[PDB]
Design an enzyme around this catalytic site. Structure first.
Site, PDB file in Angstrom:
ATOM      1  N   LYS A 147     -58.463  11.730  22.704  1.00 21.65           N
ATOM      2  CA  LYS A 147     -58.937  12.848  23.312  1.00 21.65           C
ATOM      3  C   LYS A 147     -58.649  12.984  24.847  1.00 21.65           C
ATOM      4  O   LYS A 147     -58.611  11.584  25.306  1.00 21.65           O
ATOM      5  CB  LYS A 147     -60.596  12.727  23.972  1.00 21.65           C
ATOM      6  CG  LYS A 147     -61.544  12.679  22.304  1.00 21.65           C
ATOM      7  CD  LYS A 147     -61.521  14.242  21.322  1.00 21.65           C
ATOM      8  CE  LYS A 147     -62.198  13.996  20.015  1.00 21.65           C
ATOM      9  NZ  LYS A 147     -62.138  15.706  19.248  1.00 21.65           N
ATOM     10  N   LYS A 197     -56.785   8.353  15.312  1.00 16.06           N
ATOM     11  CA  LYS A 197     -56.831  10.374  15.269  1.00 16.06           C
ATOM     12  C   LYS A 197     -56.392  10.836  15.847  1.00 16.06           C
ATOM     13  O   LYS A 197     -56.627  10.533  16.952  1.00 16.06           O
ATOM     14  CB  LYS A 197     -57.289  10.534  13.748  1.00 16.06           C
ATOM     15  CG  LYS A 197     -58.393  10.975  14.098  1.00 16.06           C
ATOM     16  CD  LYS A 197     -59.702  11.455  13.608  1.00 16.06           C
ATOM     17  CE  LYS A 197     -59.477  12.888  12.800  1.00 16.06           C
ATOM     18  NZ  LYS A 197     -59.345  14.089  13.755  1.00 16.06           N
ATOM     19  N   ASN A 198     -55.172  11.383  14.858  1.00 16.12           N
ATOM     20  CA  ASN A 198     -55.312  12.896  16.280  1.00 16.12           C
ATOM     21  C   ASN A 198     -56.024  13.074  16.224  1.00 16.12           C
ATOM     22  O   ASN A 198     -56.639  14.444  14.882  1.00 16.12           O
ATOM     23  CB  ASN A 198     -53.269  13.669  15.190  1.00 16.12           C
ATOM     24  CG  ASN A 198     -52.753  13.638  15.751  1.00 16.12           C
ATOM     25  OD1 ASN A 198     -51.505  13.536  15.714  1.00 16.12           O
ATOM     26  ND2 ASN A 198     -52.590  13.514  17.347  1.00 16.12           N
ATOM     27  N   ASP A 199     -56.903  14.348  17.169  1.00 14.04           N
ATOM     28  CA  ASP A 199     -57.323  14.906  17.144  1.00 14.04           C
ATOM     29  C   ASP A 199     -56.484  16.394  15.633  1.00 14.04           C
ATOM     30  O   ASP A 199     -55.486  16.561  16.091  1.00 14.04           O
ATOM     31  CB  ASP A 199     -58.509  16.281  18.174  1.00 14.04           C
ATOM     32  CG  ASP A 199     -59.229  16.439  18.307  1.00 14.04           C
ATOM     33  OD1 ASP A 199     -59.529  16.922  17.341  1.00 14.04           O
ATOM     34  OD2 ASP A 199     -60.019  16.038  19.601  1.00 14.04           O
ATOM     35  N   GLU A 200     -57.329  16.497  15.323  1.00 17.85           N
ATOM     36  CA  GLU A 200     -56.899  17.664  14.538  1.00 17.85           C
ATOM     37  C   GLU A 200     -55.641  18.960  15.073  1.00 17.85           C
ATOM     38  O   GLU A 200     -54.891  19.287  13.863  1.00 17.85           O
ATOM     39  CB  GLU A 200     -58.224  18.568  13.670  1.00 17.85           C
ATOM     40  CG  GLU A 200     -59.136  19.633  14.599  1.00 17.85           C
ATOM     41  CD  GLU A 200     -60.476  19.423  15.608  1.00 17.85           C
ATOM     42  OE1 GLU A 200     -60.490  18.465  15.501  1.00 17.85           O
ATOM     43  OE2 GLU A 200     -60.328  20.016  16.098  1.00 17.85           O
ATOM     44  N   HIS A 257     -59.125  16.366   7.086  1.00 17.53           N
ATOM     45  CA  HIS A 257     -59.800  16.977   7.889  1.00 17.53           C
ATOM     46  C   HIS A 257     -60.177  17.915   7.785  1.00 17.53           C
ATOM     47  O   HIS A 257     -59.808  19.068   6.940  1.00 17.53           O
ATOM     48  CB  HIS A 257     -58.732  16.986   8.819  1.00 17.53           C
ATOM     49  CG  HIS A 257     -60.336  17.286  10.391  1.00 17.53           C
ATOM     50  ND1 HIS A 257     -60.492  18.224  10.859  1.00 17.53           N
ATOM     51  CD2 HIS A 257     -60.615  16.097  11.626  1.00 17.53           C
ATOM     52  CE1 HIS A 257     -61.093  18.433  12.086  1.00 17.53           C
ATOM     53  NE2 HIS A 257     -60.615  17.084  12.064  1.00 17.53           N
ATOM     54  N   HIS A 300     -63.713  14.001   5.651  1.00 15.94           N
ATOM     55  CA  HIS A 300     -64.536  14.076   6.972  1.00 15.94           C
ATOM     56  C   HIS A 300     -66.010  14.448   6.235  1.00 15.94           C
ATOM     57  O   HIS A 300     -65.764  15.723   4.969  1.00 15.94           O
ATOM     58  CB  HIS A 300     -63.823  14.658   8.042  1.00 15.94           C
ATOM     59  CG  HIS A 300     -63.497  14.268   8.794  1.00 15.94           C
ATOM     60  ND1 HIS A 300     -63.813  13.368  10.730  1.00 15.94           N
ATOM     61  CD2 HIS A 300     -62.153  13.454   8.916  1.00 15.94           C
ATOM     62  CE1 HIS A 300     -62.701  13.690  10.741  1.00 15.94           C
ATOM     63  NE2 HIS A 300     -61.534  13.130   9.834  1.00 15.94           N
ATOM     64  N   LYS A 333     -73.031  14.818  16.099  1.00 14.23           N
ATOM     65  CA  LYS A 333     -72.978  16.713  17.184  1.00 14.23           C
ATOM     66  C   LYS A 333     -73.336  17.704  16.245  1.00 14.23           C
ATOM     67  O   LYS A 333     -73.565  19.088  16.683  1.00 14.23           O
ATOM     68  CB  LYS A 333     -72.326  16.506  18.115  1.00 14.23           C
ATOM     69  CG  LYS A 333     -70.399  17.065  17.190  1.00 14.23           C
ATOM     70  CD  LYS A 333     -69.461  16.768  18.290  1.00 14.23           C
ATOM     71  CE  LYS A 333     -68.309  16.883  18.166  1.00 14.23           C
ATOM     72  NZ  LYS A 333     -67.298  16.683  18.901  1.00 14.23           N
TER      73      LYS A 333
HETATM   74  O1  LIG Z   1     -62.988  17.474  17.792  1.00 15.30           O
HETATM   75  C1  LIG Z   1     -63.566  16.859  16.681  1.00 15.30           C
HETATM   76  O2  LIG Z   1     -65.158  17.087  17.573  1.00 15.30           O
HETATM   77  C2  LIG Z   1     -63.690  15.369  16.392  1.00 15.30           C
HETATM   78  O3  LIG Z   1     -62.651  14.264  16.364  1.00 15.30           O
HETATM   79  C3  LIG Z   1     -64.417  14.307  16.338  1.00 15.30           C
HETATM   80  O4  LIG Z   1     -64.751  14.351  18.246  1.00 15.30           O
HETATM   81  P1  LIG Z   1     -65.739  13.373  18.403  1.00 15.30           P
HETATM   82  O5  LIG Z   1     -65.639  11.747  18.670  1.00 15.30           O
HETATM   83  O6  LIG Z   1     -65.468  13.021  20.504  1.00 15.30           O
HETATM   84  O7  LIG Z   1     -67.267  14.172  18.344  1.00 15.30           O
HETATM   85  C4  LIG Z   1     -63.856  15.336  14.803  1.00 15.30           C
HETATM   86  O8  LIG Z   1     -62.620  16.385  14.358  1.00 15.30           O
HETATM   87  C5  LIG Z   1     -64.793  15.655  14.430  1.00 15.30           C
HETATM   88  O9  LIG Z   1     -65.965  15.249  13.555  1.00 15.30           O
HETATM   89  C6  LIG Z   1     -64.636  17.185  12.918  1.00 15.30           C
HETATM   90  O10 LIG Z   1     -66.105  17.618  12.019  1.00 15.30           O
HETATM   91  P2  LIG Z   1     -66.372  16.581  10.675  1.00 15.30           P
HETATM   92  O11 LIG Z   1     -66.161  15.509  10.248  1.00 15.30           O
HETATM   93  O12 LIG Z   1     -67.754  17.323  10.275  1.00 15.30           O
HETATM   94  O13 LIG Z   1     -65.546  17.280   9.830  1.00 15.30           O
HETATM   95 MG   LIG Z   2     -61.217  16.896  15.931  1.00 13.82          MG
END
Ligand SMILES: O=C(O)[C@@](O)(COP(=O)(O)O)[C@H](O)[C@H](O)COP(=O)(O)O
Ligand SMILES: [Mg+2]
Ligand SMILES: O=C(O)[C@@](O)(COP(=O)(O)O)[C@H](O)[C@H](O)COP(=O)(O)O
Ligand SMILES: [K+]
Ligand SMILES: [K+]
Ligand SMILES: [Mg+2]
Ligand SMILES: [Mg+2]
Lengths: 459, 454, 162
Positions: B167, B192-195, B288, B322, B330
């Protein structure tokens, strides 16, 4: 966060004039017991660009400059508009071009799972010139089909189509025999969306039998015929193998071939495989599955207008836009705005004006419970017939067979273009009149005195 | 048109359809639109639009076609339930290798039937794949066992992989990004790369990949432990996905087996997932699911649930997916989502309607993510029953009051607390990084451990 | 030209005149002197073309020249606030060399990849070379350079074609 991700002082006209932002308009409701409307919209913009749900030590001033911003809210109408700096969107390393996957991941990705949002659906989006020019856009259009048909390349008119029905079950020669029959009266045939390489209708056998039916129909009628083959696969290499085999087999009829991709279920990656590998073959985007999010019953994801506008950027030559309430699927008369957004160089969506800067048009492909009787009403609502319409049930369900079914579709559009009364017109056009007796419930609703007027018995 | 006689056979026994092994079964929660047909008529038209028919009778139909009709075999109108049997001959197969494709399963079982004007809604809750169709799917080629082997853990029950997400989601330039990787890797295993992270103009892909490769070498030299990274290689263009993947493996060189490839499988689609699975079968495929909530939310009465999404991903060959936080984070989720984890890890498991034998197909890891942190972890593991998984906490690591590394050690210590069966508040007095997570997320600490300030 | 007008921010209908030059000397400029001449012209103009034989000469290696020109394009665009265009000669006997050149240019130019035209010496290398560029890079402006054509097209010639 409401200070960081929300700037309601920004003027939409200036954000458009600046040309540095993608804009998105959503209908959103905060979940009860969490934040107010602007707080929820600010957290939504955070989860759609640079933030998460807590403050992080790694944030710098540079990051703050690429934040998505809430620039307009109308809580009474559940409306939220967000401005996305164009630098957020991913670009290919190989050619510097845009990808719709990145637009989707940011603008309608993780924000669809937020625990503090009841729902949020995208109704419109704006792409400025600096981002629009990086998309593939269509390489082949209806103009290329009109040229193969020998029609004028400007306003070449209506392409009479069908879908081979049954959806699945026909073996290779019965399939090709239905193709030949329809082509005696019509122009275009589309695979039904799941037809491919089933064990009872192997792909290569069906493709060869259809190539022979096309030659036979063209020899018989003296007219060019078109076929749209489903090349959808999970594996990119399977999609190439299918496409390559079709073009080689069709040989001197290879420019009569369209490639159909189930773009919503297989995804943008499948659509781009076809667009980049076969740019000189009409790319027919089939949207099976889309209703899970586009239905008006859904308050999540995005509308059919948004799906269609993305498809033009992806390079679909044509996309199914629905029957606009005139057929069997969910649709409304106001969906005519979808067709103009994909065909015109300048058009209005529900929230944003869009200049396409000469990007090629995408054909609105009309399909789903259509038949000769429902067509004049459809065209009155749309305003033109420069499109492809496919009627599976409406052709092969005709009382006298697929060839008569094809002529009823041809004759139905000729009736509309002439401004004739359909019931009066039917007395001179046998195949059109026999569609009244083929779909009598439709005829009773659309033309209440048809039995007495055409001189047929029963009711 | 009333298509009940042809497309409905409620005399069929589910046990016999399973024993026969010639049908895919799907269970839906469906409501007919008011003023149209009754429940059975609507279910019959739905089966027609999902297999061999349209909304009217056609002259071209033959007896052979009737034999491949999808059939409604069970209805429970009081609970809005409809179960349909799909002859497996309906599903498309590749010309190149005779293998199945999930695109065809989707097009038939949850495609055009989602636009029907006479249906208010219909959502798939479960599906059954018989051996003759299951064996034609890729299934996973790489699993958590391969990550455990790179980490030097036992390849059977190798335990918890401590992870994070870099982040901010976007904004970090190449060296600040790699510096945050190095810091977390001093205490954790996986990043992990953020998506959406890829080749943005402010963080070019090749520069970021090289800076991360250098941070991995530096952290491994410093700690003496192996470190893992999951790179987003998602693209519309298959050839861009190959270019990204090839560049990463060549750059990481002797650390190439420390790399996972992340694909945004819900937004880019099954075609993107298969590109990664078939081109890079020896690299852990991290699915993802960004965007999935548009249909999987319990608020949605359309499409399919997260259970169905996860079960398909295993067939597609995701090494991990996931599965959500099962109500502990959250995002939208429920405690009963633990059944999702067992369906994707076990050889035999029960969905809400169907038992599934996986016939030795490799497991898919539950990747736990979304608003997780060291305080929320012991409750999550109690609900699931094991910690043989990857958990990524972005905010829970980089939001820790003492930084990334401390954030990582609080995630490590939180799972060590659960495995020991210790009380988290009592355990925190001996574990500084774990205790400092209480002060990092004080609203969470006030709810989960009311008397913690001591 | 509509695609070049769009990159320049001009109207896509009658977008008007594109001011261009050719980097002279025809051959002899090393990579940085070449790129310095590009930067200077781009302070006032829009488009620069490789002189027709410019490629991978031993004194101006292709990759070094391409990288120095990519840096000059960024510098001129930052300085002027206007988009700039370059037409690179990717002519080769070997189809695979033409692909390698083109692919390297697009990857190097990155977010400026839509500012690139590909020049092919279509009369000397032939229709096969023109089609290589047209089919491999349909989204890059194909600049047909006709060096050599005068051997037949000259009014002095009574053979071939005009
Ligand atoms: O971008 C985000 O919000 C995250 O990187 C979590 O970051 P945080 O740890 O800061 O919350 C993931 O992509 C979510 O968990 C996706 O949801 P899911 O697993 O349900 O697919
Ligand atoms: Mg993410
Ligand atoms: O399978 C079908 O139902 C169709 O072939 C129509 O057949 P019929 O003519 O017999 O009804 C089309 O795929 C639908 O129109 C898709 O819906 P949409 O265009 O809305 O995406
Ligand atoms: K405003
Ligand atoms: K039954
Ligand atoms: Mg169809
Ligand atoms: Mg010259």
């Amino acid at each position: 966060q409401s200070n960081r991700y929300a700037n309601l002082n920004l003027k939409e006209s200036e954000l458009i004039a600046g040309g540095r932002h993608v804009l998105c308009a959503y209908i959103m409701k905060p979940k009860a017991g969490f934040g107010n409307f602007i707080q929820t919209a600010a957290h939504f913009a955070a989860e759609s660009s640079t933030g998460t749900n807590v403050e992080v030590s790694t944030t710098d001033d540079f990051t703050r400059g690429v934040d998505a911003l809430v620039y307009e809210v109308d809580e009474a109408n559940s409306l939220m508009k967000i401005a996305y700096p164009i630098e957020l969107f991913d670009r290919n390393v190989i050619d510097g071009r845009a990808m719709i996957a990145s637009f989707l991941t940011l603008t309608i990705g993780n924000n669809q799972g937020m625990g503090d949002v009841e729902y949020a659906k995208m109704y419109d989006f704006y792409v400025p010139p600096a981002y629009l020019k990086l998309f593939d856009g269509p390489s082949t259009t209806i103009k290329d089909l009109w040229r193969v048909l020998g029609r004028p390349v400007i306003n070449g008119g209506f392409i009479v189509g069908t879908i081979i029905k049954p959806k699945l079950g026909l073996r290779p020669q019965p399939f090709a025999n239905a193709c030949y029959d329809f082509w005696l009266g019509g122009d275009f045939i589309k695979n039904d969306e799941p037809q491919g390489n089933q064990v009872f209708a192997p792909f290569k056998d069906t493709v060869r039998a259809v190539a022979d039916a096309m030659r036979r129909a063209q020899d018989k009628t003296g007219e060019a015929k078109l076929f749209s083959f489903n090349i959808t696969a999970d594996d990119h290499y399977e999609m190439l193998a299918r496409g390559e085999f079709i073009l080689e087999t069709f040989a001197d009829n290879a420019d009569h071939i369209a490639f159909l991709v189930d773009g919503y279920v297989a995804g943008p990656a499948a659509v781009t495989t076809a667009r980049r590998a076969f740019p000189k073959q009409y790319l027919h985007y089939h949207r099976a599955g889309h209703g899970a999010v586009t239905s008006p019953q859904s308050k999540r994801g995005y509308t059919a207008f948004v799906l269609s506008k993305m498809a033009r950027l992806q390079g679909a030559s044509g996309i199914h836009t629905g029957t606009m309430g005139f057929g069997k699927m969910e649709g409304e008369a106001a969906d005519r705005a979808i067709a103009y957004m994909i065909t015109e160089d300048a058009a209005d969506g529900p929230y944003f004006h869009q200049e396409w800067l000469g990007m090629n048009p995408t054909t609105p492909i009309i399909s789903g419970g259509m038949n000769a009787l429902r067509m004049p009403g459809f065209f009155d609502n749309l305003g033109h017939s420069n499109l492809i319409m496919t009627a599976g049930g409406g052709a092969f369900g005709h009382v006298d067979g697929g060839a008569a079914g094809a002529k009823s579709l041809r004759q139905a559009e000729q009736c509309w273009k002439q401004g004739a009364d359909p019931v009066e017109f039917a007395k001179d056009h046998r195949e059109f009149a026999r569609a009244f007796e083929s779909f009598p419930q439709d005829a009773d609703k659309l033309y209440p005195n048809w039995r007495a007027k055409l001189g047929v018995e029963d009711t």
